[PDB]
Design an enzyme around this catalytic site. Sequence first.
Site, PDB file in Angstrom:
ATOM      1  N   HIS A  73       0.826  -1.202   0.000  1.00  0.00           N
ATOM      2  CA  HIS A  73       0.000   0.000   0.000  1.00  0.00           C
ATOM      3  C   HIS A  73       0.862   1.254   0.000  1.00  0.00           C
ATOM      4  N   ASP A  94       9.131  20.333 -26.988  1.00  0.00           N
ATOM      5  CA  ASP A  94       9.213  19.081 -26.244  1.00  0.00           C
ATOM      6  C   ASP A  94      10.398  19.177 -25.290  1.00  0.00           C
ATOM      7  N   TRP A 142       7.929   0.243   4.574  1.00  0.00           N
ATOM      8  CA  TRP A 142       8.509   0.966   3.449  1.00  0.00           C
ATOM      9  C   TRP A 142       9.915   1.451   3.766  1.00  0.00           C
ATOM     10  N   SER A 200      14.379   5.861 -12.846  1.00  0.00           N
ATOM     11  CA  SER A 200      13.360   6.624 -13.561  1.00  0.00           C
ATOM     12  C   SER A 200      13.321   8.068 -13.077  1.00  0.00           C
ATOM     13  N   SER A 201      13.281   8.261 -11.756  1.00  0.00           N
ATOM     14  CA  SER A 201      13.212   9.607 -11.200  1.00  0.00           C
ATOM     15  C   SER A 201      14.467  10.413 -11.506  1.00  0.00           C
ATOM     16  N   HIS A 214      13.701  12.719   4.676  1.00  0.00           N
ATOM     17  CA  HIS A 214      13.057  14.036   4.954  1.00  0.00           C
ATOM     18  C   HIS A 214      13.005  14.938   3.710  1.00  0.00           C
ATOM     19  N   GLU A 242      12.529  14.042   0.873  1.00  0.00           N
ATOM     20  CA  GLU A 242      11.477  13.397   0.040  1.00  0.00           C
ATOM     21  C   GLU A 242      10.084  13.941   0.364  1.00  0.00           C
ATOM     22  N   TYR A 246       9.203  16.557   0.763  1.00  0.00           N
ATOM     23  CA  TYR A 246       9.104  17.878   0.159  1.00  0.00           C
ATOM     24  C   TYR A 246       9.098  17.817  -1.359  1.00  0.00           C
ATOM     25  N   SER A 297      -1.126  27.479  -5.961  1.00  0.00           N
ATOM     26  CA  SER A 297      -0.828  28.867  -6.304  1.00  0.00           C
ATOM     27  C   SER A 297      -1.529  29.277  -7.591  1.00  0.00           C
ATOM     28  N   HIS A 355      15.388  14.325  12.819  1.00  0.00           N
ATOM     29  CA  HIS A 355      14.205  14.422  13.717  1.00  0.00           C
ATOM     30  C   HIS A 355      13.405  13.116  13.573  1.00  0.00           C
ATOM     31  N   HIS A 356      13.714  12.293  12.561  1.00  0.00           N
ATOM     32  CA  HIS A 356      13.054  10.973  12.394  1.00  0.00           C
ATOM     33  C   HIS A 356      13.862   9.993  13.244  1.00  0.00           C
ATOM     34  N   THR A 387       7.147  28.514   5.321  1.00  0.00           N
ATOM     35  CA  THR A 387       5.877  27.825   5.129  1.00  0.00           C
ATOM     36  C   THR A 387       4.707  28.712   5.535  1.00  0.00           C
ATOM     37  N   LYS A 418       3.845  31.222   3.010  1.00  0.00           N
ATOM     38  CA  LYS A 418       3.004  30.730   1.928  1.00  0.00           C
ATOM     39  C   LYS A 418       1.549  30.619   2.359  1.00  0.00           C
ATOM     40  N   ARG A 471       2.230   1.858  16.092  1.00  0.00           N
ATOM     41  CA  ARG A 471       2.057   1.678  14.657  1.00  0.00           C
ATOM     42  C   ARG A 471       2.310   0.230  14.259  1.00  0.00           C
TER      43      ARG A 471
HETATM   44  C1  HEA Z   1       3.904  15.962   2.157  1.00  0.00           C
HETATM   45  C2  HEA Z   1       4.381  15.332   3.211  1.00  0.00           C
HETATM   46  C3  HEA Z   1       4.901  16.023   4.426  1.00  0.00           C
HETATM   47  C4  HEA Z   1       5.040  17.450   4.727  1.00  0.00           C
HETATM   48  C5  HEA Z   1       4.719  18.650   3.886  1.00  0.00           C
HETATM   49  C6  HEA Z   1       5.598  17.408   6.105  1.00  0.00           C
HETATM   50  C7  HEA Z   1       5.907  18.659   6.830  1.00  0.00           C
HETATM   51  C8  HEA Z   1       6.471  18.789   8.189  1.00  0.00           C
HETATM   52  N1  HEA Z   1       6.770  17.719   8.960  1.00  0.00           N
HETATM   53 FE1  HEA Z   1       6.550  15.671   8.520  1.00  0.00          FE
HETATM   54  N2  HEA Z   1       6.293  13.638   8.034  1.00  0.00           N
HETATM   55  C9  HEA Z   1       5.826  13.097   6.891  1.00  0.00           C
HETATM   56  C10 HEA Z   1       5.389  13.883   5.737  1.00  0.00           C
HETATM   57  C11 HEA Z   1       5.380  15.346   5.645  1.00  0.00           C
HETATM   58  N3  HEA Z   1       5.801  16.173   6.623  1.00  0.00           N
HETATM   59  C12 HEA Z   1       5.766  11.618   6.847  1.00  0.00           C
HETATM   60  C13 HEA Z   1       5.303  10.722   5.739  1.00  0.00           C
HETATM   61  C14 HEA Z   1       6.284  11.242   8.154  1.00  0.00           C
HETATM   62  C15 HEA Z   1       6.453   9.873   8.749  1.00  0.00           C
HETATM   63  C16 HEA Z   1       7.446   9.006   8.004  1.00  0.00           C
HETATM   64  C17 HEA Z   1       7.558   7.745   8.813  1.00  0.00           C
HETATM   65  O1  HEA Z   1       8.105   7.820   9.925  1.00  0.00           O
HETATM   66  O2  HEA Z   1       7.082   6.686   8.363  1.00  0.00           O
HETATM   67  C18 HEA Z   1       6.539  12.554   8.782  1.00  0.00           C
HETATM   68  C19 HEA Z   1       7.057  12.634  10.139  1.00  0.00           C
HETATM   69  C20 HEA Z   1       7.453  13.887  10.764  1.00  0.00           C
HETATM   70  C21 HEA Z   1       8.391  13.893  11.900  1.00  0.00           C
HETATM   71  C22 HEA Z   1       9.016  12.714  12.561  1.00  0.00           C
HETATM   72  C23 HEA Z   1       7.997  12.232  13.565  1.00  0.00           C
HETATM   73  C24 HEA Z   1       8.439  10.910  14.100  1.00  0.00           C
HETATM   74  O3  HEA Z   1       8.708   9.984  13.312  1.00  0.00           O
HETATM   75  O4  HEA Z   1       8.501  10.807  15.334  1.00  0.00           O
HETATM   76  C25 HEA Z   1       8.560  15.305  12.229  1.00  0.00           C
HETATM   77  C26 HEA Z   1       9.449  15.793  13.306  1.00  0.00           C
HETATM   78  O5  HEA Z   1       9.529  16.979  13.540  1.00  0.00           O
HETATM   79  C27 HEA Z   1       7.751  16.083  11.271  1.00  0.00           C
HETATM   80  C28 HEA Z   1       7.686  17.536  11.250  1.00  0.00           C
HETATM   81  C29 HEA Z   1       7.241  18.284  10.084  1.00  0.00           C
HETATM   82  C30 HEA Z   1       7.300  19.753  10.117  1.00  0.00           C
HETATM   83  C31 HEA Z   1       7.790  20.644  11.229  1.00  0.00           C
HETATM   84  C32 HEA Z   1       6.765  20.116   8.808  1.00  0.00           C
HETATM   85  C33 HEA Z   1       6.591  21.497   8.314  1.00  0.00           C
HETATM   86  O6  HEA Z   1       6.891  21.561   6.917  1.00  0.00           O
HETATM   87  C34 HEA Z   1       5.158  21.933   8.566  1.00  0.00           C
HETATM   88  C35 HEA Z   1       5.077  23.449   8.642  1.00  0.00           C
HETATM   89  C36 HEA Z   1       3.628  23.865   8.731  1.00  0.00           C
HETATM   90  C37 HEA Z   1       3.198  24.878   9.498  1.00  0.00           C
HETATM   91  C38 HEA Z   1       4.121  25.710  10.328  1.00  0.00           C
HETATM   92  C39 HEA Z   1       1.731  25.204   9.512  1.00  0.00           C
HETATM   93  C40 HEA Z   1       1.440  26.190   8.397  1.00  0.00           C
HETATM   94  C41 HEA Z   1       1.996  27.535   8.795  1.00  0.00           C
HETATM   95  C42 HEA Z   1       1.264  28.468   9.420  1.00  0.00           C
HETATM   96  C43 HEA Z   1      -0.174  28.248   9.771  1.00  0.00           C
HETATM   97  C44 HEA Z   1       1.925  29.773   9.770  1.00  0.00           C
HETATM   98  C45 HEA Z   1       1.945  29.977  11.269  1.00  0.00           C
HETATM   99  C46 HEA Z   1       2.924  29.009  11.880  1.00  0.00           C
HETATM  100  C47 HEA Z   1       3.530  29.270  13.041  1.00  0.00           C
HETATM  101  C48 HEA Z   1       3.278  30.533  13.809  1.00  0.00           C
HETATM  102  C49 HEA Z   1       4.489  28.263  13.585  1.00  0.00           C
HETATM  103  N4  HEA Z   1       6.889  15.217  10.418  1.00  0.00           N
HETATM  104  C1  HEA Z   2       0.169   9.047  -1.074  1.00  0.00           C
HETATM  105  C2  HEA Z   2       0.312   8.317   0.015  1.00  0.00           C
HETATM  106  C3  HEA Z   2      -0.826   7.681   0.733  1.00  0.00           C
HETATM  107  C4  HEA Z   2      -2.264   7.707   0.442  1.00  0.00           C
HETATM  108  C5  HEA Z   2      -3.025   8.397  -0.662  1.00  0.00           C
HETATM  109  C6  HEA Z   2      -2.789   6.865   1.553  1.00  0.00           C
HETATM  110  C7  HEA Z   2      -4.232   6.608   1.665  1.00  0.00           C
HETATM  111  C8  HEA Z   2      -4.906   5.800   2.694  1.00  0.00           C
HETATM  112  N1  HEA Z   2      -4.261   5.174   3.701  1.00  0.00           N
HETATM  113 FE1  HEA Z   2      -2.192   5.145   4.104  1.00  0.00          FE
HETATM  114  N2  HEA Z   2      -0.101   5.080   4.403  1.00  0.00           N
HETATM  115  C9  HEA Z   2       0.871   5.702   3.699  1.00  0.00           C
HETATM  116  C10 HEA Z   2       0.612   6.566   2.543  1.00  0.00           C
HETATM  117  C11 HEA Z   2      -0.702   6.845   1.945  1.00  0.00           C
HETATM  118  N3  HEA Z   2      -1.874   6.379   2.426  1.00  0.00           N
HETATM  119  C12 HEA Z   2       2.264   5.464   4.154  1.00  0.00           C
HETATM  120  C13 HEA Z   2       3.551   6.002   3.595  1.00  0.00           C
HETATM  121  C14 HEA Z   2       2.080   4.571   5.296  1.00  0.00           C
HETATM  122  C15 HEA Z   2       3.122   3.962   6.198  1.00  0.00           C
HETATM  123  C16 HEA Z   2       3.257   2.474   5.905  1.00  0.00           C
HETATM  124  C17 HEA Z   2       4.183   1.829   6.906  1.00  0.00           C
HETATM  125  O1  HEA Z   2       3.950   1.985   8.120  1.00  0.00           O
HETATM  126  O2  HEA Z   2       5.145   1.152   6.491  1.00  0.00           O
HETATM  127  C18 HEA Z   2       0.608   4.403   5.329  1.00  0.00           C
HETATM  128  C19 HEA Z   2      -0.016   3.552   6.334  1.00  0.00           C
HETATM  129  C20 HEA Z   2      -1.462   3.431   6.489  1.00  0.00           C
HETATM  130  C21 HEA Z   2      -2.044   2.946   7.761  1.00  0.00           C
HETATM  131  C22 HEA Z   2      -1.301   2.526   9.002  1.00  0.00           C
HETATM  132  C23 HEA Z   2      -0.755   1.121   8.789  1.00  0.00           C
HETATM  133  C24 HEA Z   2       0.134   0.714   9.939  1.00  0.00           C
HETATM  134  O3  HEA Z   2       0.843   1.573  10.504  1.00  0.00           O
HETATM  135  O4  HEA Z   2       0.131  -0.485  10.281  1.00  0.00           O
HETATM  136  C25 HEA Z   2      -3.496   2.992   7.531  1.00  0.00           C
HETATM  137  C26 HEA Z   2      -4.491   2.628   8.570  1.00  0.00           C
HETATM  138  O5  HEA Z   2      -5.679   2.721   8.345  1.00  0.00           O
HETATM  139  C27 HEA Z   2      -3.725   3.514   6.155  1.00  0.00           C
HETATM  140  C28 HEA Z   2      -5.045   3.733   5.553  1.00  0.00           C
HETATM  141  C29 HEA Z   2      -5.264   4.570   4.371  1.00  0.00           C
HETATM  142  C30 HEA Z   2      -6.632   4.793   3.839  1.00  0.00           C
HETATM  143  C31 HEA Z   2      -7.942   4.265   4.366  1.00  0.00           C
HETATM  144  C32 HEA Z   2      -6.382   5.641   2.666  1.00  0.00           C
HETATM  145  C33 HEA Z   2      -7.350   6.204   1.695  1.00  0.00           C
HETATM  146  O6  HEA Z   2      -8.573   5.462   1.749  1.00  0.00           O
HETATM  147  C34 HEA Z   2      -7.610   7.669   2.026  1.00  0.00           C
HETATM  148  C35 HEA Z   2      -8.422   8.384   0.950  1.00  0.00           C
HETATM  149  C36 HEA Z   2      -7.616   8.495  -0.326  1.00  0.00           C
HETATM  150  C37 HEA Z   2      -7.947   7.868  -1.469  1.00  0.00           C
HETATM  151  C38 HEA Z   2      -9.166   7.003  -1.591  1.00  0.00           C
HETATM  152  C39 HEA Z   2      -7.070   8.045  -2.682  1.00  0.00           C
HETATM  153  C40 HEA Z   2      -7.812   8.867  -3.723  1.00  0.00           C
HETATM  154  C41 HEA Z   2      -6.948   9.152  -4.929  1.00  0.00           C
HETATM  155  C42 HEA Z   2      -6.618   8.211  -5.829  1.00  0.00           C
HETATM  156  C43 HEA Z   2      -7.050   6.780  -5.705  1.00  0.00           C
HETATM  157  C44 HEA Z   2      -5.757   8.594  -7.004  1.00  0.00           C
HETATM  158  C45 HEA Z   2      -6.640   8.998  -8.172  1.00  0.00           C
HETATM  159  C46 HEA Z   2      -6.934  10.477  -8.083  1.00  0.00           C
HETATM  160  C47 HEA Z   2      -6.370  11.390  -8.893  1.00  0.00           C
HETATM  161  C48 HEA Z   2      -5.389  11.016  -9.962  1.00  0.00           C
HETATM  162  C49 HEA Z   2      -6.731  12.832  -8.724  1.00  0.00           C
HETATM  163  N4  HEA Z   2      -2.449   3.649   5.390  1.00  0.00           N
HETATM  164 CU   LIG Z   3      11.045  14.747   7.518  1.00  0.00          CU
END
Ligand code: HEA
Ligand code: HEA
Ligand SMILES: [Cu+2]
Lengths: 49, 534, 55, 128, 98, 36
Positions: free
Chosen positions: B62, B92, B127, B157-158, B241, B243, B245, B256, B290-291, B316, B319, B438
């Site tokens: 998944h 192109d 994963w 590919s990427s 991390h 990634e 982004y 935007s 931080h991970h 952030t 934006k 988890r």
């Molecule tokens: C698109 C995906 C995406 C994005 C954009 C982000 C964005 C951020 N993420 Fe993360 N993150 C994940 C995907 C993402 N993340 C995934 C997949 C994991 C788990 C992976 C795994 O362990 O399996 C993860 C896990 C993860 C961890 C590790 C947690 C753990 O494993 O214990 C941390 C630690 O700090 C973190 C922090 C942040 C922060 C600070 C931002 C910042 O970019 C967010 C900033 C946002 C704001 C600040 C709010 C908007 C701003 C405002 C409203 C302005 C006002 C704000 C202030 C006054 C502060 N996220």
């Molecule tokens: C893009 C990334 C992505 C997306 C879309 C999702 C979507 C969903 N995921 Fe998650 N999930 C992960 C990334 C994602 N997930 C990752 C990285 C983990 C960690 C795995 C690990 O622990 O190893 C995880 C783990 C995870 C867990 C925890 C498993 C565990 O820790 O044991 C659960 C639990 O319910 C869950 C449920 C769901 C459900 C119900 C949806 C969906 O039902 C939510 C609704 C969204 C959709 C129905 C998709 C709609 C869009 C499309 C189908 C594409 C077509 C559309 C266009 C082209 C516009 N997934």
């Molecule tokens: Cu990160």
Amino acid sequence: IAPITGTIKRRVIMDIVLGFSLGGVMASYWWWGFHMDKINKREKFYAEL
Amino acid sequence: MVQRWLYSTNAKDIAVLYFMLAIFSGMAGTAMSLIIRLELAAPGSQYLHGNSQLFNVLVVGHAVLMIFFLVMPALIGGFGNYLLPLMIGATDTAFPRINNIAFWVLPMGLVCLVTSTLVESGAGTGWTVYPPLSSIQAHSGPSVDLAIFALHLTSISSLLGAINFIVTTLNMRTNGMTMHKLPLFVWSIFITAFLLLLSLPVLSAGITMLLLDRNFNTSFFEVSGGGDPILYEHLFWFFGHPEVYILIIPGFGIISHVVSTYSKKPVFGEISMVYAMASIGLLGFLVWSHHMYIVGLDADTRAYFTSATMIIAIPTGIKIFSWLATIHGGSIRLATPMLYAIAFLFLFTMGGLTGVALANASLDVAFHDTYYVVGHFHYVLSMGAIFSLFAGYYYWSPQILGLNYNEKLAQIQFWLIFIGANVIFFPMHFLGINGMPRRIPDYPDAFAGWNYVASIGSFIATLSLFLFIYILYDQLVNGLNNKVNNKSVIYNKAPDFVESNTIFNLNTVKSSSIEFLLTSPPAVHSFNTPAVQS
Amino acid sequence: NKVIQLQKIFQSSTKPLWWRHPRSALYLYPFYAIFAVAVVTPLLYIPNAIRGIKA
Amino acid sequence: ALSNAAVMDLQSRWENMPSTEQQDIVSKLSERQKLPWAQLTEPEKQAVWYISYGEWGPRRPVLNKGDSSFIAKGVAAGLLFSVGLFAVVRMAGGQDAKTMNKEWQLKSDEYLKSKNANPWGGYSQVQS
Amino acid sequence: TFEEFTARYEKEFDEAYDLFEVQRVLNNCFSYDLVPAPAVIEKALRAARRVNDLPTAIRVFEALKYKVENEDQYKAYLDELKDVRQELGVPLKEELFP
Amino acid sequence: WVITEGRRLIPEIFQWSAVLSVCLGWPGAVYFFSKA
Ligand code: HEA
Ligand code: HEA
Ligand SMILES: [Cu+2]
Ligand SMILES: [Ca+2]
């Protein structure tokens, strides 16, 4: 004729002012309504200890 | 014909192929989520008999199918390949022949992944394929070897796609398009490609180290031999991390562009927007551990990583506010893309606040490896990147395909997915704060409350996906009739207040990009004589 | 050298680029024979591996 | 002026009106405007405004009159079908755990209460 | 400044040679944050008469009614503009009942 | 400006408190209706 200007400016100011004020009560109710309630019931059991 | 699709060199056909592969993998990966929710609906093994395997394998499938086979080929390979040449003005891409191999190595990875799942062992490692559990003693089959080979194919590919986009942007622009005057989507793609270029090789090195250690006897991470299983964490997350982004920066360009067309006013402070977009990419390379807070690092490096990760919120936030300032004064058109953008602005800010809450190393000892983090990253992934993907589709599809899509039947899908995803992913934060870990198939009885609610909500989102598939069918079939009757909306910008209906019909599109001026569908050879700007 | 007379042949040929040179038939025909064995033989061992029989 | 039959109620009459027939009216309307106003007939002043600034062609709203109620009923139907289909698939599942009897859950509390599980908050463990 | 604003749209409207330009300038004058002065509006009315478009003159006050933001200030613009409006023949939307 | 802004501002804060209480307070309904 009164030169109506800056309608947006103050409307912008009040919008930002209300957002902090409305967010102020949300923040303040968490601290002094919920979180402060948790501390007191926490201290009572330790007080009897 | 075989020549047109097997020997493709046209970038638009490769974009269509990328799109077509993304939906199939999207449906395949969203059924495993359905099975996971059905297994977690109630305590006890309900549907999968007792197999803890085939649960972790399903989770790995998944995650990989959702990340590496839906978002990557749709946002980068689908939209980036189709729209970057058109907005820049290039006919192109720079390397048209490696653009095809950037795609055709993806189906091979699907074969490697499926045959990995079908071997008697399977790959129940997550994963993040950590060495000691995915070593040869604990996973003794050829399964994770085949899983690793898929990662190499996606990485190549990427990488070959990223090299194509940097050269294309740098020296294939039109007669007036200085690097200072670019659309924001191109800027997002450019910065994403640069992040990919610098991040992929480290992942390749670590993954090949894991392969050689399993089969070539190198004490790379073997404890008996001086190896360190924590070096793998550094090597993997240095790509990890940055990634998180690559999957959101092209999601920023879409938002935007959306919020300044249905709100008839240009973006507030564009140069600050590109500065903030570049700063997030640059500074995300300084926060990877931080991970790895609880792995046993030094106290002083934890303070550094805590201080550096909070700076992410400064650009952030810029934006977030600049999006709320370009809609303040203009006239708002509440269409489906605008409804997706407005939902994104709220849900991504809800995710980011939880993210900054997770950024403190002293607090993360209570929120790590729980459903709290799952609820966090499902807001920025399933509500931050998926929503901008839906918004981009509803934004560009009538221009690309030439077929309208019955507005009122799409707003129903929007509301269904909104109130379905909010039901799945909001209760998770309640499960996480009580300490629900988890990656488990079955949980203590006291956690049965919110899990049932979350399981009910998955069916709503699945029904919305089925409705979306029907919308696709009704768009491809008798979609030319949708713009004859009154089922859809034709013009994305209504006339101004003092603009008559007979003057709007000589200047129909007031856009700031070449995309909406082209014929629908765009010609095979779009630009014979180059376009001139300023 | 021969580049001038090779230029006149590759241009004005109306054939695929890998078939234009008169010596191309020697490489292409043996290649597709070996290529087919390369991409079909590993696909025969897939069901044998799913059952678990090791050769 | 212009014929009374054509101009009067030229709003509900704009749609379902032949294209060539409606292109003749705007040619007549344009010429009569190049003439001092306050002489134009009242039916005409409501006609020229509607063609310029009416809700036809462009300016047609995103949603029609009945679309708002249709979307509301469609969304509610989707929730009914999802919940109804949720229960059907739940029938084709395994039996519940033997610890969900409400007498197991009542007995779980005596163990917790003797150990003083939660001083602030509860240890009810009852969800039957 | 406000006086510079008024004196520069007083010149823009005097140079509008078609019905596309008149509807372009008035969409610029009412796009600014300030409500225009009554001297500005009078020149806009003259432009509509020059390009022979009755419905854009009607929309001038409709634009002002939403722009002026006050129920008495709309009457203030109403009183000073009675002579020019009645002389031209522009009807208000409420009076017209369209 | 006090007279004009009052007619529009204050009613919205009441509508404001309703919607935000729905998006955030919905799980309170499920627990009360039948935590059982
Ligand atoms: C698109 C995906 C995406 C994005 C954009 C982000 C964005 C951020 N993420 Fe993360 N993150 C994940 C995907 C993402 N993340 C995934 C997949 C994991 C788990 C992976 C795994 O362990 O399996 C993860 C896990 C993860 C961890 C590790 C947690 C753990 O494993 O214990 C941390 C630690 O700090 C973190 C922090 C942040 C922060 C600070 C931002 C910042 O970019 C967010 C900033 C946002 C704001 C600040 C709010 C908007 C701003 C405002 C409203 C302005 C006002 C704000 C202030 C006054 C502060 N996220
Ligand atoms: C893009 C990334 C992505 C997306 C879309 C999702 C979507 C969903 N995921 Fe998650 N999930 C992960 C990334 C994602 N997930 C990752 C990285 C983990 C960690 C795995 C690990 O622990 O190893 C995880 C783990 C995870 C867990 C925890 C498993 C565990 O820790 O044991 C659960 C639990 O319910 C869950 C449920 C769901 C459900 C119900 C949806 C969906 O039902 C939510 C609704 C969204 C959709 C129905 C998709 C709609 C869009 C499309 C189908 C594409 C077509 C559309 C266009 C082209 C516009 N997934
Ligand atoms: Cu990160
Ligand atoms: Ca179960």
